[PDB]
Design a protein around this ligand. Sequence first.
Ligand SMILES: [Cl-]
Ligand SMILES: [Cl-]
Ligand SMILES: [Cl-]
Length: 193
Amino acid sequence: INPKFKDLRAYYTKPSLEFKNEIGIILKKWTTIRFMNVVPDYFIYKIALVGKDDKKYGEGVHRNVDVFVVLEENNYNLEKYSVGGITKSNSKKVDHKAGVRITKEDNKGTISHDVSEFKITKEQISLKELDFKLRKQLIEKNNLYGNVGSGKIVIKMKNGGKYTFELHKKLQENRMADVIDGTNIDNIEVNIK
Ligand SMILES: [Cl-]
Ligand SMILES: [Cl-]
Ligand SMILES: [Cl-]
């Protein structure tokens, strides 16, 4: 485990929480960004509204919301804070899978291959969740951010289109708020260099 990747490895090995079929509460702005409050247990989670989420959710109550949460440190003196990951709750049952192909190349030049399948149980999924779950898998199973920490994850959609997450840096915050049709994910290709 190499220190120039220690930040990336620490972030992508955090615990995540998934809150489904919840209610979101947006209070009046009190700092430079707005938050959606979610209360699934005895804690109040503040979810930053970044990217498209700002114009998407007005002040007030928002029902049928699902959130993929990763507690992070912040400059707003908030205890339970997470960015993006908000999706609309399911309209119906979803039971879809996407095949994952991994190729890894060492600093030695050693090349490995691996495969898995990524289960999808949500009609609408955030890039935050795809990005986060996959990297965590890559770290735990393929030693991502140990020996090497660059490359890409590419989610391919059934219609043709692609979303690519560059491994050398965290997923951009504005992108943690983008959302896609889970049912339209075809397969996932990962190249670790
Ligand atoms: Cl708030
Ligand atoms: Cl609790
Ligand atoms: Cl469901």
